[PDB]
Each structure stands twice: as structure tokens, then as C-alpha cells.
Amino acid sequence: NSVSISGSTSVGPVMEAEAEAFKTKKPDVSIEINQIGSSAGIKNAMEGVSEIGMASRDLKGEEKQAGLKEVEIAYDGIALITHKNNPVKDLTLVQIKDIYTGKITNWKELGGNDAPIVVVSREDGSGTRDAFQEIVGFKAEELTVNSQISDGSGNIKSLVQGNENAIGYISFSYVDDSVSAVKVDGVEATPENVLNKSYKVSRPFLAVYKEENLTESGKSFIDFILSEEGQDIVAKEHLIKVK
Numbered sequence: 001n002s003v004s005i006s007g008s009t010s011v012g013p014v015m016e017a018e019a020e021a022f023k024t025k026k027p028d029v030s031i032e033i034n035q036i037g038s039s040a041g042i043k044n045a046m047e048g049v050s051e052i053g054m055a056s057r058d059l060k061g062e063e064k065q066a067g068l069k070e071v072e073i074a075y076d077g078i079a080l081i082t083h084k085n086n087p088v089k090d091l092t093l094v095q096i097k098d099i100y101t102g103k104i105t106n107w108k109e110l111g112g113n114d115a116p117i118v119v120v121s122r123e124d125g126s127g128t129r130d131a132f133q134e135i136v137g138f139k140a141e142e143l144t145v146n147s148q149i150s151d152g153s154g155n156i157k158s159l160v161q162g163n164e165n166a167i168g169y170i171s172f173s174y175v176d177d178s179v180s181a182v183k184v185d186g187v188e189a190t191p192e193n194v195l196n197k198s199y200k201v202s203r204p205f206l207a208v209y210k211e212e213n214l215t216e217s218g219k220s221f222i223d224f225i226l227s228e229e230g231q232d233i234v235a236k237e238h239l240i241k242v243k
């Protein structure tokens with residue numbers, strides 16, 4: 001019948017592409033997808049507000065308590081994006097930590113322009129923010145007080161597009177010619193390099209649900225996403241197919 005899904009903004013676009021193709025496979029099934037961030041999607045799945053929650057990170061310890069079933073539908077790299085005109089094309093993971101904690105505050109320190117770094121972070125509740133902080137190696141408390149907060153993947157892309165001195169983080173699936181992803185420790189931000197583990201900033205895309213709430217229609221949609229046709233859609237969105 002009608003399958004309610006809510007959660008990650010990183011997963012939103014591939015989920016919409018999956019729903020569009022699934023409408024030709026099971027025409028009597030309707031899927032409603034709402035993008036509200038990973039933490040809210042997981043909470044909605046836990047409470048039965050959504051039949052399926054979308055997360056762009058592993059579940060936190062406190063969320064593991066709920067006993068949600070977890071299904072990996074893809075893997076995704078997190079790119080460090082700058083304005084397309086920034087001469088800096090390379091950052092080390094150590095430099096990324098120093099920028100985000102406010103130890104490095106001007107692009108001149110990174111060999112770029114004599115200009116301040118406009119640090120952009122996602123809102124609290126973002127799966128991308130939680131995975132990024134964990135891998136880069138700093139706590140929320142250590143984030144520079146000068147950081148801009150952008151609500152959702154779309155807004156962090158828009159802020160970086162419009163500010164020559166900005167830096168932000170986003171799913172590879174949102175990267176296009178309007179922004180530039182830096183190489184991290186000499187490694188290009190590609191699905192190949194996420195899969196061979198040389199590009200360290202990455203995370204799963206998960207569909208989470210309570211076994212008692214998942215309908216035959218919801219189960220059919222997850223199975224479609226994991227099928228060869230479902231995984232071809234995942235690759236077309238610059239994601240990594242489930243290994």
C-alpha cells in the first residue's frame with residue numbers, strides 16, 4: 001500500500017531514484033520520502049512514525065538499544081568541498097581537523113590565498129556531521145565557534161557555491177562541476193577509492209526498521225534496492241554498491 005520513509009538528506013536523492021524505478025515494478029505501491037536528517041529518521045523508525053528510517057551513518061550506541069533491523073543499501077564517501085575558484089586542491093586529514101577546530105584560520109596556511117577560512121558544518125542530527133567528526137577526529141565541543149551551520153546537504157552545497165572562501169562536507173552524490181572536492185592525503189574523492197579504503201572519510205547508507213512494522217510492500221522496496229537493477233541506480237548516483 002503506502003510506505004512512509006524519513007531521514008538522511010544524503011540518502012534522499014538515491015531513495016527518490018529507487019522509488020521512481022520501483023513504481024514501474026510494483027505499481028500498486030506508493031512510497032513517501034521526507035528528508036529530515038539521519039538522527040530524526042532513526043528516531044521516527046524507532047517510534048513507528050516512519051515504517052523505514054534512512055541513515056547515512058552507523059547507528060550510535062544509544063540507538064542500538066531499540067533493536068532496529070539494519071540493511072546496508074550502499075556506501076558513500078564524504079567530500080571536502082570548496083568554491084570552484086579556490087587554488088587549494090589538496091588537504092591532509094590532519095589539516096582538515098585543524099581547520100574544523102580553528103587551529104588553521106586562513107587559506108595562506110594551506111598555501112592558498114591570504115583570506116579567512118569560512119568553515120561550514122551541518123546541523124546537529126546530521127549523519128554526515130557525526131561520521132565526519134568521528135573519522136577526522138574531533139568532538140562537537142571542539143568545532144570552531146566561527147563555523148557556519150547549514151541545514152541539510154542542499155544548503156551546505158549552496159553556501160560553498162556562493163562563498164569563495166568557504167569549505168564544507170557533503171555526500172559524493174551531491175558533488176558536481178559547481179564546486180570542487182579536494183584530494184585528501186593525495187587521494188581523489190571517488191567511489192573506487194572509498195571501496196579500496198584509501199579514501200578514509202566514508203560511511204554506509206542504511207534502511208532501518210522495526211520487524212513488527214515492515215509491510216510486504218516495504219520489504220519488496222528494500223529487496224528492489226538490493227537487486228541488480230536497484231544497485232545499478234546506486235552506482236549512477238556516484239555511490240558504492242553493497243560489497
Ligand SMILES: [Cl-]
Nearest residue numbers: 061064065066
Ligand atoms: Cl543495549
Ligand SMILES: [Cl-]
Nearest residue numbers: 122123124149
Ligand atoms: Cl545545529
